[PDB]
Symmetry: D2
Subunit: 338 residues, 4 copies
Amino acid sequence: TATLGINGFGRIGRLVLRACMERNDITVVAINDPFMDVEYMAYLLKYDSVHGNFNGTVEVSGKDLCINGKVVKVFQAKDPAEIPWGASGAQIVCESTGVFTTEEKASLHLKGGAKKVIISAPPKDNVPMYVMGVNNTEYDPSKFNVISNASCTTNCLAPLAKIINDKFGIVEGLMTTVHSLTANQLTVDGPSKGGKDWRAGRCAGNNIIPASTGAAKAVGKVIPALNGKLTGMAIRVPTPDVSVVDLTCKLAKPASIEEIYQAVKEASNGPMKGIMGYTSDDVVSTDFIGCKYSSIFDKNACIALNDSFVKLISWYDNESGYSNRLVDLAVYVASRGL
Amino acid sequence: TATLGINGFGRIGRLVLRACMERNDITVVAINDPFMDVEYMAYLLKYDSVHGNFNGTVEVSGKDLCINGKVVKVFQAKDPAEIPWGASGAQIVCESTGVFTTEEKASLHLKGGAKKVIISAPPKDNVPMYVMGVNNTEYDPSKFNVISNASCTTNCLAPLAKIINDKFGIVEGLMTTVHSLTANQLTVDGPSKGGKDWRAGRCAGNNIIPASTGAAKAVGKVIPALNGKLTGMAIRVPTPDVSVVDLTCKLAKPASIEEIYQAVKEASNGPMKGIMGYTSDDVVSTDFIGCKYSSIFDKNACIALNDSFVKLISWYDNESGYSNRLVDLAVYVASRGL
Amino acid sequence: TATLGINGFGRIGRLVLRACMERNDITVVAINDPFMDVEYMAYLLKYDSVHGNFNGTVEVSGKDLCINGKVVKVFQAKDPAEIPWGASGAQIVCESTGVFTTEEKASLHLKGGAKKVIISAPPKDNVPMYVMGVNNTEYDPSKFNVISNASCTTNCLAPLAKIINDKFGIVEGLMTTVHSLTANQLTVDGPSKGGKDWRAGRCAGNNIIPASTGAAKAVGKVIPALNGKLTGMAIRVPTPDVSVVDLTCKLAKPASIEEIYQAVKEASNGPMKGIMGYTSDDVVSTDFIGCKYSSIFDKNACIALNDSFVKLISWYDNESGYSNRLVDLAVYVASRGL
Amino acid sequence: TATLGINGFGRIGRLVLRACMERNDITVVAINDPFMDVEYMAYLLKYDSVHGNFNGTVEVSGKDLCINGKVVKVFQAKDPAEIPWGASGAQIVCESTGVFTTEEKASLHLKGGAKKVIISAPPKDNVPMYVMGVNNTEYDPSKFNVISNASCTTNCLAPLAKIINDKFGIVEGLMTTVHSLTANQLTVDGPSKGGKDWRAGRCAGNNIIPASTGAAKAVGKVIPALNGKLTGMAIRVPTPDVSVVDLTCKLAKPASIEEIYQAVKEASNGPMKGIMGYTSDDVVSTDFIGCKYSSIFDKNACIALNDSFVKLISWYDNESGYSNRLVDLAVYVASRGL
Ligand SMILES: NC(=O)c1ccc[n+]([C@@H]2O[C@H](COP(=O)([O-])OP(=O)(O)OC[C@H]3O[C@@H](n4cnc5c(N)ncnc54)[C@H](O)[C@@H]3O)[C@@H](O)[C@H]2O)c1
Ligand SMILES: NC(=O)c1ccc[n+]([C@@H]2O[C@H](COP(=O)([O-])OP(=O)(O)OC[C@H]3O[C@@H](n4cnc5c(N)ncnc54)[C@H](O)[C@@H]3O)[C@@H](O)[C@H]2O)c1
Ligand SMILES: NC(=O)c1ccc[n+]([C@@H]2O[C@H](COP(=O)([O-])OP(=O)(O)OC[C@H]3O[C@@H](n4cnc5c(N)ncnc54)[C@H](O)[C@@H]3O)[C@@H](O)[C@H]2O)c1
Ligand SMILES: NC(=O)c1ccc[n+]([C@@H]2O[C@H](COP(=O)([O-])OP(=O)(O)OC[C@H]3O[C@@H](n4cnc5c(N)ncnc54)[C@H](O)[C@@H]3O)[C@@H](O)[C@H]2O)c1
């Protein structure tokens, strides 16, 4: 049974813990976050403005947390090397602070005794990215101690792109993701951290905000065959959670929406079960809150100009789907020997 | 000077009036709306959650309105034929009820003394559509008494599509328009008007909602050369006003974003002055509230996969841009003889 | 087991059905709504932006619905007297259309064979109002066949006022309820249904909107001793669900927030179990979505100027609390003999 | 002509500058904000998600700004003592960083050459607070070099309380302010800066959030006669700007809503012109965006239980009203002798 330690108990960090609490093949044993006292952590875990009250019990036991009768050690270290993961028995660390996305920084968790590290975001350097159901079996435990679970958008696009490319072939594609807001955004017009993404610093509650994303490009690394064939952008909107991918692509072989739908269905019911999903109902974003799939094809919203040029629509709970995939990755990593 | 009569004093009708009050080449002489007393009409004109207080004075004078010292006759006819446009001195009628989108119905305004009628939406029949700066000069007064100003989305896409197709040639394109809130969506999950668009009946305040749009095809009627080369859809988000068009297309001639940008700029400073606009700043939706342009190219938001496959982003205040275009068309129609 | 018929399959009608599906002492056997196709009814029950997916199975069976393998008859009678409640086996009717709020109209259901009717709103005439945990045992089956479950605001305020008045005595009080959005409001500035409340017709998504409410005075009828001692108003804000009562009162007997808290605690763990609740945590509105309590005291939000002038804060999921109470009342009504 | 220097170019700092640009008796000569490049500053002044595009011109000149022709020196000092106010010719400094709310920290501006300092918030120590139209004439230049313009909420309540206390006398009162969000709140559930106000760290876009505020008590300092007679709390909501005060008070002398209205009317058209305002229209929050009044009485929203127990409703653009008052205070200070 793999043990997990969480650094950065934020949106992703807390949902990863919630996912672990629902499984018997992985146990959370420690959490670190310098911006939260143990009482604050208990509070943020218990209540969620999007996913409801925690399904179980949360209590402070001395300096630590007692979640569902299990003891979870708490730390407040500003630097990863200062967290006693080993002494705590944490084998794999979910690096979800958003501030240590390189091998150099993320590897600091190793000094602390961790055996493996999973960055909950695409890396800034060459750390390998894996997407469950697409290329995770490529992971080599003898070569990597620090890996990446990519982004929420890449986890939505990769599985779909794989299915389409395998069956029909993607000549070229452009993507736009209408994405719900994130912690990086601001409630009122203000300066963005580091003064880089100016648009991201504009009132999140009343603006449609164009944004950059490397998700489409990253798919070209997770699926080499698609290198240089995809690129995209993002549009941030006021909703608290759930996003949607709009993939416009030219196919190498003709395909109707019905045929694309059938290909997605065969994949979802077989090799990508639990990862790729689909629907034919008149859904809207809130219907996916809490959905654990990485990508859900919206049949009725897809459109096609002709048999080779189509626009595919796929939903994803950027918080829930991604967190469950990170947990799946952690379990997979454990199964391959730490 | 042309005199205008407004049927349906809704979001569009009211903005059209506000636009006229600012111009000397056109005067609003009458308003008709059976769903609101004169007192309520005055209230709706003086206060607006998106465009602010009315710039001027608004008084109730008997059964009519005194706006900026001018008399505006008010009527509560339910049937377009019962409205005394001629007696009021109304030459052109702005048909903005959204219920008379056919020449048969819309033509009823002529039985009241009105000479011309402009439907503030795409017609359900064969009524000709005109987009200012694109095909309005094709209008012939001796052949049509009832015309259409198309839709807000069409007025944003058509200008852009024309510049791009003229300069580089559009082989095929797919559009997605992210729309702000409209008068059809619901505040809470409830029955849709007609029980046809189920998604549109879902809570608009906390949902991303896929929707249909005929704009892409309408552009194929406004610009015959693009007939059958475009199609699209919409995605509604919880913002009060301002929308954006995401146009993904394959070009005939290779073109960089810089060149596309330069081409828009030339048209914007020339044959489409006041219609086509452009920006290179990190703008967000709220920056366009009140903007009178039909379409505003967002240079930094555009992205290109190759020199022949690009995604263009263009903003448009779905209310202000469109309304001002309808008044421009009214003025144009009058300049051609009634 | 008591059987329920639902007239008006709106927000309340649907949640009433969801509430019944979880209980074994009451079953919905029929639904009537002439402005909603069964296919759409199935859709609205299956999906909800606020309460999530329906916990169970909903299928269209001919012209009726099959819910959890049970046939629920569906009608389209615009006139209550035309609904075959009796033939359908419906004993008690949940009148939730919002248009038959008088004894004259509501009693038409009796012509259809129903034995009792519960109006899901305060009546326009003198139909008796009952609030579970407050005055429902005053219901006399031999004298009334038509009753009212009052309003969501009243169900929140009445239990709290009863506790405070019983223990300390309320000399006089003023209430303000901050309400989350409801169907009544509009997504954009426009005419209100009836043209009475101009403010209510303003854009609900970006406005704080003052409004009227008779809940404070209704409490004076539900609790006679408080007649003439309470009055109040409402303030609508752009949040999807869950509201809060802000009660400012002068007490006849001195009391600290701690003692008021204990009094509420006693009631909540005693005579008002499942009706009145309480919390000492730093909660926010979303933490109550789905909560079945009628009123939840927020200890930390309460404030006192002195020992006899206090401001008490109580939360309520205006949809979930109210609906579960209506069902409780239906079960209570049946237990008293039909 | 008074000169102004601004430290903390945030919501208030930028609106203070905007207010100045519209006046001929005061000029901004310098701005300091370490989290903004001169280009970023130009951008944030040029665009505003709530108050629209800047009315005038803004260009980067070397390392400074050129606003409407006037040159404005730009600094990036994190430590107040390091800002060369004196050399820049800035006489009065607007301390709007939100982090230097004490005489000790704020007075550090004097070391740079500034002559007077105004903290744009209530102080954490004994720095005197002044509310234009209420007690600003009690200012004494020979006594203080550092003063406070109190809070936005206090500027709304103080004028109203003074009028009511002067005319009828306030026995006791409890206040609740429904407040739009601020920069302190978060877009998604997270840890509040400092680990204090936990509720303030909950998703701002979809929650009704109770909060503390010393504004009511502060009124007791600005109006000694009211010390110990008022207190209150706040309720934060998703709107970007504009707030409303709900004052429930017991009057020493009986008074009707009409009489209270007349008293505010007299004050508004007399001693408090430009400060206290009133309305009898069906207004909503957006109608006050850009309003320069400190407090606007909503006659129709007020309600009374008796002749001595009333609930008064008063609006205020927390950003615009306050900023203009701060500028009014700066001019008043200059007129007293620097
Ligand atoms: N929000 C999403 O839907 C989503 C989806 C996929 C991936 N991600 C990625 O996951 C990461 C976290 O995202 P999030 O949305 O949960 O952000 P968040 O802001 O909600 O949480 C980040 C946490 O990091 C903590 N933190 C900051 N510095 C720290 C330090 N030195 N040590 C330990 N903790 C520290 C913060 O206190 C916070 O609790 C980011 O890299 C993000 O891009 C986010
Ligand atoms: N909202 C937009 O941004 C936008 C943009 C482009 C085009 N349009 C089109 O413009 C039209 C109006 O849109 P809107 O958003 O202003 O709608 P709206 O709901 O705000 O107003 C419609 C008005 O029609 C009135 N009406 C109904 N029957 C009438 C009758 N018989 N005579 C006179 N008035 C009558 C209503 O009382 C109402 O005031 C629609 O056809 C719409 O599709 C809207
Ligand atoms: N929304 C709340 O949180 C809440 C809380 C307490 C009380 N209430 C009250 O409950 C009632 C219903 O509220 P709601 O939000 O569900 O309304 P709603 O607008 O969501 O639904 C009303 C339903 O009435 C139906 N209807 C109209 N005429 C009908 C007829 N002749 N026969 C059958 N159905 C008919 C409509 O088709 C619709 O489905 C109202 O009186 C309301 O004031 C609502
Ligand atoms: N927002 C309101 O409606 C309102 C109303 C009344 C009073 N106030 C008070 O005004 C102050 C500012 O409020 P705001 O909403 O504009 O905040 P804000 O977050 O919008 O702006 C604060 C600015 O301070 C800057 N800053 C931080 N440290 C600095 C430093 N060392 N030197 C110079 N600048 C620095 C930030 O970069 C930012 O631009 C606070 O004290 C607040 O409580 C705000």
